């Protein structure tokens, strides 16, 4: 059936998962597990950026605006990435990591601390929710874009260019949504809700890292910590 342009293009702008696992997995080789995961996160964050750099209207923007956009949505993109991977993982007993690993919820239930434990379960509630709505790649992809440009226009230099990117994305989703998912429920508005949820997790996730930081647990050259401070 008829798919919006923005969704088609954006779908070509997506990298190979195996390539990601390849890229992320190889970059690792150079407590113990903790440090690895921090590095794995940082790496998925960089990969999340090359996605941005190679992005459409985002690249045509000034560097001053690119910085600020990412500085505002880096956390949501990450969490959302972790989230969608579970939409494809399907399971409810364990979480799937960008590497390829599997971690049972029983394992984090006993090992993780109050906060992470908490956050991880909250993230999974959002995974069931998005599964019910039947989230697909076309929307998934469209949604990431939307998260990238979800900022107040009073914070950018290139005013108009962004306002066009935002309205473009929302109308694209509404189209694809009312069109292909003609079942009952307003998926366009419903999905938008899942996104404000993501934004809530993002903040909690930032509070965790910050906790780790204060406690001097995070790696030294950690990228995430570099974003947390701004």
């Amino acid at each position: 059936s008829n798919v919006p342009e923005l969704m088609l293009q954006l779908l070509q702008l997506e990298p190979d998962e195996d390539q990601v696992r390849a890229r992320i997995l190889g970059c690792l080789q150079e407590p113990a597990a903790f440090g690895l995961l921090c590095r794995m996160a940082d790496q998925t964050f960089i990969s999340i950026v090359d996605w941005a750099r190679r992005c459409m209207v985002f690249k045509e923007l000034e560097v001053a605006d690119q910085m600020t956009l990412l500085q505002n949505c880096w956390s949501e993109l990450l969490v959302f990435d972790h989230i969608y991977r579970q939409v494809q993982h399907g399971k409810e007993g364990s979480i799937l990591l960008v590497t390829g690993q599997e971690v049972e919820l029983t394992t984090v239930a006993t090992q993780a601390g109050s906060l992470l434990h908490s956050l991880v379960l909250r993230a999974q509630e959002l995974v069931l929710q998005l599964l019910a709505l039947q989230l697909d790649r076309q929307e998934f992809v469209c949604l990431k874009f939307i998260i990238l440009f979800s900022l107040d226009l009073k914070f950018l230099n290139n005013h108009i260019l962004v306002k066009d990117a935002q309205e473009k994305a929302n109308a694209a989703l509404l189209d694809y949504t009312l069109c292909h998912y003609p079942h009952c429920g307003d998926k366009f508005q419903q999905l938008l809700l899942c996104l404000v949820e993501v934004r809530a997790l993002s903040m909690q996730a930032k509070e965790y890292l910050y906790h780790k930081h204060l406690g001097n647990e995070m790696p030294r050259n950690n990228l995430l910590i570099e974003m947390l401070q701004a």
Partner: peptide, 11 residues
């Protein structure tokens, strides 16, 4: 930023 300014489009 560093990892963003220097790392974004510098390479």
């Amino acid at each position: 930023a560093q990892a963003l300014a220097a790392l974004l489009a510098k390479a």
